[model samples]
Target: MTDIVYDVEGFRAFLPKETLRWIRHRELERKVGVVEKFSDRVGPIPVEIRRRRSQYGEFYHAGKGTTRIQARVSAAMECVERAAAEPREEIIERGPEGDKWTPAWYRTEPREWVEGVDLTTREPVYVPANEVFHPWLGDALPSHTNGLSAGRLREEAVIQGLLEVVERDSWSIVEYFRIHPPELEVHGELEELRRSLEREVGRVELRLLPSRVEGVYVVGAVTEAERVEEMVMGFGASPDPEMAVLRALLEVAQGLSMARRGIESPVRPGKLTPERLKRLNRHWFEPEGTVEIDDLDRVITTGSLEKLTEELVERVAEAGLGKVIEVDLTLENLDVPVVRVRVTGASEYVIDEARVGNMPEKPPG
Candidate 1:
């Protein structure tokens, strides 16, 4: 081996000069800031730019994914009007923020056909999201009680809601009518719900299997109430008498989906027991929170996700899996009827897989 040389300005004279040159080139690139993606559209409408974004599993040291995103395709005016005319109808959850950007249908739409769609759009009637109405619904609705929250609604106002039913009225909602959603009256274990989730996740991590879940569904849906009613009256048919029984189920599913998006992590880990899932879903498991996905995906806690993703990357990298890191939020192995938000988060990230080359090692003269 050549004698070790500690030179003032000629350190590379001893070691591999070519390797040093390669390292210097990489350092220059980092200094230039290669993080931001160059694009024509650089504003809130990231739609065009993000469309080309890397898939979920790939990781780069860093690229994007630190911004809030949502997609909306505006509902046609006619759809809103039809829903408003029928008693027991709603446009469904417009998502967080509790705003109904969709206008209410009050007047008739144009009879003439325009383009592919008939100009049947109705005149818009604005309705406040918070305004509660009962009894005779129209411009003026039942004054909502000071009571707030679904729990309060269930505990105190449910009787009032039933009382409102006492007055002369069929279960029909009119335009600008105030609708009160039905609430779930449960008798189960919340801990069981939570543990069931944990077991599902554990099965994925351990046995690498799936799980199932079940839930109580509500009946008597109002959104489609009019149509079902008309059919029952005119055609002598009941779309679903079970609708009243199954109505709450749909709301629970929708609410849990919202909850999943609202919560930190929907991960379930450890041993699963009947008591576990019921105990958990009692409050924590918002059926509305779940993202539409198959079962058997492993979920984890919010606090642990950042570290978990990093750990997964390290492990996969060691295993020569490249930069791909896919993590499905839900698992099929989990039992159905289980309250779950099937979240499948994957990152085929080509992240900052390579570390920065060392700083310059020039010697002093």
Candidate 2:
């Protein structure tokens, strides 16, 4: 019996209403399979890792929070979201004409396409279902967890997924171009979080990647470990620069914790040579310039989640990333809103080394 309360205001405020309803409806203990608490905390934040098994597959997720319940709920939400996002056999379909809007990331031409609605235009479109849902289909295309997210509402999930897509696109561009980004100066909450993280994990470095979308901040962080093999990196993005920096730092913290425990990093393999570490470190840590967070554009923190999602869709289009295609992956039984939001023209080099396409000429100015 999990002694967790589902009706708490704070929990309700943090999660989607529908997600809460599902938790109470199915019972959290029954849905969330295995819970593991890291004895070593990530700075002042407690970390929880959860795993849930379903017919689709085994899903594992991690979350960081100040309290046990918060961490538990956070991990459980991610677990449910990932599990729900699994491509179902019923959802897979064949189309007469293959994806007309095939992007460069599609390594091999997909034989089957999935029908999805363009969220921005609300028009039906065919996308390479195997390419779109890669690992499950065992396709040769570069598979990534870029645009997968879970939210209380479909719009909320879309927004989260789009932001992740943007973050990964920015990171891929930076790495592929080997462009040296500017170091970001942090203050207030961002500074506090950075300091706390450094105290726990020694020196951690952050660079502000030039995002394709204006007013959106994308940050990458790297840790300076005694052994090059222990070094790890994390990336984050948001309209709020401070939040973006905070997320980047926390991701680094999580990476460090996992590295110390001999757990494989989510983004990369565990074994890394000094030469590999050097190249990775230089890309994110060797800064060509500096920019203060306050000096950047005014952060967009206001507006409802739906409004924010709409604005993000507008920004992605205005940036010329291409139409935002959303495939609803929400499982009927789970009822947790999950979505795969893919930007047609976004770069997939970060996840796919054999990605076909010319890299962006330069980082965003």
Candidate 3:
């Protein structure tokens, strides 16, 4: 191993050498401050002149006899000043002051170090890493109510909403409308009516038959007051199923009468133009009503339908085929009185094969 020799002044660091011969060579190039031997020892040894500056910016080196050191020792000491002056390793989880830095092994957090002021330790601290990096950290902070938590606030809002609905109605909607069926005035009588009607008849049904074009329909029954008015105004109410449609219409007209107060008569061209009024006037006094009918394909001849139903009912009793199960009436050939009757216990008649075969190719007119 080669030995290193540094001068006492700390300005000069040197490499070790032979004591006499190296000094004799130092004399050979001897211009007090300039010499070949001085330059000679300088060539082979690795030396760096870190010239020092005086405070007023003057450059000076230590006295000429200073020694040069080995390259490795110079390289080592050059890094010392830099190492001490630089900040400490952030990864060292030392005190509250150091917690802010992204530690060397902290591969989990993707952010860089964020150091901040530390009051307690009087040194710079780190902000909480979540606040520095995570986007939702502020929103995830816990909120406290007056001695309660966030959940309690939500629960109170629900209770308040329910109370408002119960209390805020300007009119007594509760008196007129019911939350349940049993609370309404019609409930008791309707219940009794349903039971008695069921016993007397197998079942009674109201059907709104299909339409060719999209239009309003009566699905099961017409019971609502507004719908009853709509029916009377449009096609006149369907009369066969005969609930209280007429009675409801009467009630509605009386209500309209009250609403029409302070108005003398049909004032301006209110909906009835003169032509419309004239057409209505011609039919209005004649007791004719509006008739709504569906597609001709499924249209029924009402007179024929009733007559066929009567015949079938009478035949059901006479032939003892139980009661007519159902009847389908069609007006396709009105003169022929086409009706299909399904009977419950009628005899199963076989087709007359010979009679069918004997028939002409074309159907009888």
C-alpha local distance difference test of each model? 0.19, 0.68, 0.23
Regions of candidate 2 where Cα sits further than 4 Å from its true position:
1-25, 32-40, 54-59, 66-69, 96-100, 105-109, 267-276, 299-301, 356-358, 362-365
Candidate 2 local Cα displacement, residue 152, angstroms? 1.0
Global local distance difference test of model 1: 0.19
Clashing pairs in 3: 14-68, 14-69, 15-68, 100-126
lDDT of 3 at 274: 36
Poorest 10 consecutive residues by lDDT, candidate 3: 143-152
lDDT (10s digit) by residue, model 3, range 296-357 = 12221223322322332343334332323211111121111111122223221111111111
By lDDT, the best candidate is 2
TM-score of each: 0.15, 0.85, 0.13
- 181 Cα displacement, candidate 1 (Å): 17
Query: What's model 2's lDDT at 248?
Result: 80
- For residues 153-244, what per-residue lDDT tens digits would candidate 2 score against the true structure? 67767867888888888888887888889888888766877788877654777789989887688988877765664567777788877667
Clash count, one per candidate: 101, 0, 4
